[PDB]
Structure formats: C-alpha cells, structure tokens
A paper describes a structure:
AMPARs mediate fast excitatory signaling in the brain, and a change in their number or function underlies lasting forms of synaptic plasticity. AMPARs are homo- or heterotetrameric assemblies of the pore-forming subunits GluA1–4. The activation, deactivation, and desensitization of the receptor is controlled by ligand-binding domains (LBDs) which form a self-contained clamshell-like structure within each of the four subunits. Following glutamate binding, closure of the LBD clamshell around the agonist causes separation of the D2 domains, applying tension to linkers between the LBDs and the ion channel which opens the gate.
To test this, we introduced cysteines at sites on the central axis of the D2–D2 dimer interface, cross-linking of which has previously been shown to inhibit channel opening by trapping the receptor in desensitized-like states. To understand the molecular basis of this, we determined the crystal structure of cross-linked S729C ligand binding cores in apo-like conformations bound to the competitive antagonists NBQX (diffracted to 1.8 Å resolution) or ZK200775 (diffracted to 2.0 Å). AMPAR gating is driven by the separation of the D2-M3 linker regions following agonist binding. For the cross-linked S729C mutant LBD bound with NBQX (S729CNBQX) the Proline 632 separation was 22.8 Å (similar to that seen with S729CZK, 22.6 Å). This is less than the separation we calculate for the glutamate-bound mutant LBD (S729Cglu, 26.4 Å). Of the two LBD conformations we examined, only S729C, which can accommodate the relaxed dimer state when cross-linked, behaved in a manner resembling that of the wild-type desensitized channel. The fact that GluA2(R) S729C, co-expressed with auxiliary subunits and trapped in the relaxed dimer conformation by cross-linking, exhibited properties consistent with those of wild-type channels, demonstrates that this conformation does indeed mimic the behavior of the native desensitized receptor in the plasma membrane. By contrast, functional cross-linking of a different mutant GluA2(R) G724C/γ-2—which did not assume a relaxed LBD dimer when crystallized—trapped these receptors in a non-conducting state, indicating that this conformation must be distinct from that of native desensitized AMPARs.
Numbering used by the authors:
A (entry chain A): 4 to 262
B (entry chain B): 4 to 261
The structure:
C-alpha cells in the first residue's frame, strides 16, 4: 500500500533539511517537490515514502548497455511507483514511462552578471566581446545545434568553434563563470534555475529576455500504473486551484534572498 | 454509437473540398484535422460524423449569461462527443472540458512583408517607423498587456497608445494590412497561421524570429467521457510515430504554393 516516490536532490525541488540526521523518513526533506508530493498524495489518497534516486540521475538509456538509469529506470524496472521531480517530459522517455500534464513550464534562458549590456539572444548573436555558452552536453546544447531559426543558428556557429571553449561541464560551473567573468560571459540554461539563482546571494546575476523554447516538467509513472489517471487529475486540479503557482512563489521568492 | 465530432472551418485544419456540392457526409471536407479525425477514430475504433460547429466559434463563456458558446459549448451541453479542431488548451476551458496532450504546439510570432528590416520582437520594440500590433481582442493582446518581460512591456506600452490604431478585428485584416503596407506594418499572430500563410501565394509574407510564448492545440472531450483516455493515448502514439509531423508537413508544405 505505501507508494514509493522516487525523486532527486536538486534545489529548491528537494533538499536535505539542516537537521536531517535527527529526522527520519519524509521529514528529512524539504522543497517544492516535497510539498507537491504531499498534495498529490492527498488528492489521490495514498501514503508514500520519499526515496532519493540511487544514482542521482534523471533518466536516460545507457547507450552502451540499453538499460535505463536514473528515476526513469527506477520506474521502468519496478523499484518506484511514481517520480515527483523536475523531470523533463520528452518523447524518448514517453516511450517507456507516462507523464502527467506538466506541473511546471520552462525554457532556455539567458543568465548575465548584473550590468552586462545584454537583453536578448539577438544581442548575444550580433557580438563576441561577451562570450556565451551552454552545458557541454544535454538538451540546451542540442537545441542550438539543431535550430534552423537564424538567430539561434548564428549563436550555434559561434559557440561550436569558440576558443577558449564557451561550454561548461556543470550548471554550477556555468553560474560561477558568469559571476567571475566581470560581465564577459553569459550562460544559457533553464529559466527555472536561472530564476532561482537570481534570488540567491550574492544577488549578482539576472535573467534577461524571453525564454527561447518550450518544455515542461511532469510527474512520471510506469506504463500500466493504477495511478496515472489520478495523478494527472491531481496536477490539473492543483494547477487550476493556484497551488502550483503558490509553491513556485514559496520556494523561489518567499524563500528568496535578493528582494 | 457513431461519435459526433464537432470542428470548425479554418484553413488548413478543415476546408470544403472544391467539389463538396457533389459529395456528402465526411467526404465534403479536407484538411489536417479531417486527416487527424480519421487517425484518432482508427486508433480508438469508432465510426464518426464530422459536423461544423453551429455558431462558428471556438468556445467562451458569455460573461453576461454563463453559457458556453462554440465547440466548447457543444461538448459541455452534450451536442457533440469530441472536438477535433485547432482549439487552444486553456485553464478556463479545462475547468469545463478535458483536453488530450497537445497535438500541435505554437506561440505568438511575427509576420512581416518580405523586405522589411525586422528579425525579432526586440527589433520592433526599439523603433516606430514600422507599426505593429495584434488582434483587437484575444490572448495575444492579453499576453502583451500582462507581460513583465521588459521587451514585451515596451511593445505593449507602444501598441496600446499608437495612432492610428495598430490593432485589427480579424486575422484576415491583419494579413491584408501587412501585405498592403509596403513593409510598414508587422502583425503578431499564431506561428502555425503565420507559417501557413508564408506558404500561400502571393508568397509575400514571412515569419521572423523565434516564438514569443508557448501554447498548444488539443483534442477535447466532455468531462466524464468514455473517450478521453483512448483519445489521449492515440495522440501520444500518433506523435511518437511521427504521424502528426507527417500531417503538418502535408498540409503546410507539400500542399504549399511558394
Ligand atoms: N540545475 S539545472 O540547470 O536546471 C539542470 C541542468 C542539467 C540538466 C537538468 C537540469 C534540471 N533542473 O532544472 O533542475 C532538471 C533536469 N531534468 C531532467 O529531466 C534532465 O534530464 N536534466 C535536467
Ligand atoms: N490567427 S488564427 O490562427 O487564424 C486565429 C485567430 C484568432 C483566434 C484563433 C485563431 C486560431 N487558429 O490558429 O486558427 C485558432 C484558435 N483556437 C481557439 O481555440 C481560440 O479561441 N481562438 C483561435
């Protein structure tokens, strides 16, 4: 009867509480997805146990081994009943798991150090004194590689052959590069993470311009789950009631540090 | 049995065949949503009758009367079983009907007359020689009114008080305005429609820049429908199989004129 929820340590979605070793079970954790899991569980009427994905991954098919890793793998291989995490809805994942309606929308966005004279992707594309880049792997890099929109193709042509490399290995590294680069590096990343960091001390970064594309995070269940329909209904209702917007404001802005 | 499908005459989703007068039933119509209805019906295993919505509307709640009009109304009040049309997924509609996963994604986009020196919303926002606007009502105007993104707020502040009015009553009026203005009017509208018109003679308009926001069209059923889940599974499968991409290319590009 107890539903196993797989999730991932990613701020502000799921974080260890400061006193987690004194605590046990679900009370060890806090965050946007901790709150959302409680609301989903209420609407669907189940008891649940939050469990952090063992490999700290979201989920992809290991191309060497054909085996799914991450939270997706935990669902496919029967170890968890539901994933409640910032897990991107993608076609390759939809082949092996089901997603709810998105509970959060997002897109590629521009992070600058405050004071940088950049307002848009167009601004970046037409210049070079301010370097700009993405994660060295993953879907943000791929969006630019594949784009046939003129501005994003212009940007990809610059990034792919820029020296020294404008790509970074982790999000932390891209954010640190923005902060340390005295206005001469801009970093392309998820709007949600960009907005979160804009509310973190030292309050020296800023999101500029509109989002470049459209994606969503969804609640995932194994195919054939007795839960898929109730979960989708719960996301719909929570969205309609403003609960998702309330949780976003809680974890990004009420708990933000930059006013 | 026989599922009543409500839809709307909107190119290239649903159109009268040139020879519709000789024809009857579903065979009078052609288009992306006609083909999609046939595929959904196949995957779900039902026979169906296509019917054009009586009042020619998508669906809104008459704020005076509480009564839903359009295809949404036909679902809510039991006159149709499923809507297969370019019907936007919105929260106020989700309160009274169910939507599938989106079968088409779209967003606000910029139409220019070819030769116009504009590539982006930022380009429009920084000048005035080229007027630009939206429909006089609806969600594109609301997007600009409500936006807190600097560039779109700048565009709204310009549009709301621009003289003469930059707004238009119909999309036909906006496209004709672009075409007749020798490059001094640009029109903000749905990317899907912009892309369609770009492939139509006289081949004098163009979509520039990326989309400004994110929306979707979905298949709609009344709440509690025995069809909602099968319809959703069918959209998922048709998307995964590439059929939706194939139909888009058919009606926008294989059948394009440019
Ligand atoms: N700190 S980060 O820039 O944004 C970030 C960087 C890189 C990959 C991310 C990711 C985030 N995220 O928002 O938490 C979620 C997420 N979800 C997935 O499903 C996936 O495959 N990859 C990711
Ligand atoms: N520029 S337009 O593009 O010709 C167009 C103009 C105005 C409203 C539209 C609309 C389209 N469309 O794509 O067909 C679909 C649609 N669907 C709805 O549900 C709704 O409420 N309003 C609309």
């Amino acid at each position: 009867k107890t539903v196993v929820v797989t999730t991932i340590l990613e701020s502000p979605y799921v974080m260890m509480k400061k006193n987690h070793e004194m605590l046990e079970g679900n009370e060890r954790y806090e965050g946007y997805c901790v709150d959302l899991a409680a609301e989903i569980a209420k609407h669907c009427g189940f008891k649940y146990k939050l469990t952090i994905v063992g490999d700290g991954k979201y989920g992809a098919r290991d191309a060497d081994t054909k085996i799914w890793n991450g939270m997706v793998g935990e669902l496919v291989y029967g170890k968890a009943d539901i994933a409640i995490a910032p897990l991107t809805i993608t076609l390759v994942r939809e082949e092996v798991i089901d997603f709810s309606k998105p509970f959060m929308s997002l897109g590629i966005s521009i992070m600058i150090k405050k004071g940088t004279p950049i307002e848009s992707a167009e601004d970046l594309s037409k210049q070079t004194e301010i370097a700009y880049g993405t994660l060295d792997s993953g879907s943000t890099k791929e969006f630019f590689r594949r784009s046939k929109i003129a501005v994003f193709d212009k940007m990809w042509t610059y990034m792919r052959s820029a020296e020294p490399s404008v790509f970074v290995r982790t999000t932390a590294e891209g954010v640190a590069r923005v902060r340390k680069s005295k206005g001469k590096y801009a970093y392309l990343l998820e709007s949600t993470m960009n907005e979160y960091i804009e509310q973190r001390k030292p309050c020296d970064t800023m999101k500029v311009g509109g989002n470049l594309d459209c994606k969503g995070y969804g609640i995932a269940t194994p195919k054939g789950s007795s839960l898929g329909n109730a979960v989708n209904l719960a996301v719909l209702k929570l969205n309609e009631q403003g609960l998702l917007d309330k949780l976003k404001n809680k974890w990004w802005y009420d708990k933000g540090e930059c006013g």
